[PDB]
Amino acid sequence: VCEADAPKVVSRGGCGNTQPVVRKDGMKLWGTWKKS
Amino acid sequence: PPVSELITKAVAASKERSGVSLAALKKALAAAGYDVEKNNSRIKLGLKSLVSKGTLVQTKGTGASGSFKLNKK
Ligand SMILES: [Zn+2]
Numbered sequence A: 001v002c003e004a005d006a007p008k009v010v011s012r013g014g015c016g017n018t019q020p021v022v023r024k025d026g027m028k029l030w031g032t033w034k035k036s
Numbered sequence B: 001p002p003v004s005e006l007i008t009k010a011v012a013a014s015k016e017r018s019g020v021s022l023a024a025l026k027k028a029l030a031a032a033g034y035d036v037e038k039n040n041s042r043i044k045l046g047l048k049s050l051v052s053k054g055t056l057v058q059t060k061g062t063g064a065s066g067s068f069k070l071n072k073k
Helices: B003-013 B022-031 B040-052
Strands: A021-025 A028-032 B056-060 B067-070
Touching: B003 B022, B003 B040, B003 B067, B022 B040, B040 B056, B040 B067
Parallel strands: none
Antiparallel strands: A021 A028, B056 B067
16 A cells, blocks of 8 residues: 555655556566455 | 535544544534534435445444444555
8 A cells, every 4th residue: 555644644645545466477467456 | 515525524524443423423514514403314325325435434333323434445
């Protein structure tokens, strides 16, 4: 995740979107989003 | 302004680890000058829409009787 707060609430400017699990199959870059 | 913003703002202002209850949401919107009496049925609907949009996580109870938090995901 791109945490918007650095570990009062102080924001580092981040967004909060989850990250994909990148994988390579030939020349095609797949990215697996494990939502919840 | 639509009730979904007023609810989202109230849940953001009272942010915590438990979650604003429907009674606290009533209190915050009434303190924000919003008639929570006549439009209570609108609130339950709008709140349900926000849960159906996934914007609010139900943390306890079922439906509008519960506690809710802003879905940071
Ligand atoms: Zn980010």
